[PDB]
Each structure stands twice: as C-alpha cells, then as structure tokens.
C-alpha cells in the first residue's frame, strides 16, 4: 500500500445521531454495543493477521532442481559458519551473530568492527577497521549456487456500503424529526427563519439568469436595464483599470 490513505468517492461510515429521545428508541445503545464489538473483533483479527508472519566427452546436465533453497558455501565461509550448505539468510544471520558474540563493534564507532583472523581470511582483506555495510556486501560475493551433475570420462465491501447508505437514511429521518420538533416547541422564530431563508435562497438561485447564449447576444441587458443596474455601471471602473 501507499504511505497515505487512498481518497475514494463513496462515503465510509457516516455518524449515528445522538439527539433522538431514548424514552422512545432505547436501541441506539444496543447498535452502539454491536459497533464497538465489531471494532474489538476487527482489532483482534488485524493483530493476528500482522503477527502470523511475525576424444573423450563429459556429461553436463542442468537438472530440474536447480533451486536456491540450499545454496553452496565457499569453504572459508563454511568453516566460519559450520554448516555445509544451508541458505543465504541463515548465512547472514550466522555471520552477524558471530560478530555480535566476539564484541567487535565498540566497547562510525558501531559501524567499524575489529577485524580478526578468520574474518579477514574469509574476506581476503587486511584492514583493522572496516564498516559492516561492506562486510555484508561481501556475503553476496562469497556465495555460489549449487553445482549440477558433472560426469567426466468482495461481498463485504457491498455489505458495508449498504450499512453506510442505511445510516445516511437514518440521519435523514432524524433531521426531519428534529425540524418538526423544534417547530413544535417554539414556532414563531422558525417560521420567520423560513420566510427569510427561503427568500434568500430564491434570490441566490435567481442570481444567474442573464448569462445565457441568446440572452447576451441580444440587446436586453445593456440598453434600458437601469432597473438591473448591476453591469454597465462597471464601465467607469473597468476602463480605468485598462482591461477595456
């Protein structure tokens, strides 16, 4: 995956209302218990999913089983490890644990090690300090592959989408409840709010009707519409700014 979450088009777990009276519903607590039950169970599953991985001619035949599960060791590195032909990651871990046993870092101070006899023999170098990066880079060179035979002579997304859609319908029904409840308590200063805001939103929707194709190619904007006053009064300003 990425380093940041993926934006997506459809909603994802919108809220549950809390202002409904519990003397009538008495059920949102139970759905709440089910939701934190799901979150706890999902926490357990995600932790376990993370922790589950935590002339005479010769015969040359390249076999079926040329396989890097058991890779050949150089005999110097075989003497340093001890095993005959084990693996590559086992080799890296064994070399690093040998270095960690012999206390060679420092008693870059932890990058530089103290080169001893066998390790200089298996690396064919003669320094005293050499960083661990190059030491484990040489492991890639010191290992050779195994020799062949030689003879000479989902539905859950849609389900969660449905639960999200249903919770949105719950939000819609709760908002339509709360409107009529607040109108039921004090009706004066919500009907005045309606008569104000409906008028203002009608003016906002009717703020765009003189910008059509054939309403601007004609002449019934510029001439005789001092009733409108909005444009053709900017021309004292727009020429003075050089736009034209």
């Amino acid at each position: 995956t990425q380093t940041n979450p993926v934006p997506v088009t459809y909603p994802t777990d919108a809220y549950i209302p809390t202002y409904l009276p519990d003397d009538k519903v008495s059920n949102l607590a139970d759905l709440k218990k089910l939701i934190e039950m799901d979150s706890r169970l999902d926490l357990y599953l995600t932790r376990r999913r993370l922790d589950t991985s935590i002339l005479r001619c010769s015969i040359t035949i390249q076999l079926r089983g040329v396989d890097g599960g058991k890779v050949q060791y150089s005999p110097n590195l075989a003497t340093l490890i001890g095993m005959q032909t084990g693996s590559v990651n086992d080799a890296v871990y064994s070399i690093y644990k040998y270095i960690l046993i012999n206390n060679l870092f420092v008693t870059p101070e932890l990058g530089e090690v103290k080169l001893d006899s066998l390790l200089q023999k298996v690396l064919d170098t003669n320094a005293a300090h050499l960083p661990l990066m190059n030491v484990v880079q040489t492991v890639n060179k010191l290992v050779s592959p195994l020799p062949p035979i030689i003879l000479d002579y989902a539905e859950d997304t849609a389900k969660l989408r449905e639960i999200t859609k249903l919770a949105l319908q719950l939000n819609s029904s709760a908002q339509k409840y709360q409107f009529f409840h607040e109108l039921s308590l004090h009706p004066r200063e919500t009907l005045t709010h309606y008569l104000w805001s409906s008028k203002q939103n009608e003016l906002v929707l009717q703020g765009d009707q003189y910008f059509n194709e054939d309403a601007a190619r004609t002449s019934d904007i510029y001439s005789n519409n001092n009733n409108d006053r909005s444009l053709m009064g900017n021309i004292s300003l727009l020429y003075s700014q050089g736009r034209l």
Binding site: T79, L80, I81, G82, M83, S94, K97, Y98, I101, L118
Partner: peptide, 30 residues
Amino acid sequence: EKLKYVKESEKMLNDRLSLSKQILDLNKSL
C-alpha cells in the same frame, strides 16, 4: 512454546560457533 524453542535453538547455535572456535585449536597443532 515459542519461547522454549528459541531459548534452546540459540544455545545450539552458540554451541555450533564454539565448536568451530575449538576446531581452530585442532588445526594449529598440525
């Protein structure tokens, strides 16, 4: 059991390295 596998396998690996360091003795006297 995950602990009692590792706490014996690491001692086995330490013994496998100490045996190589003792095989170092038997090739100095030859």
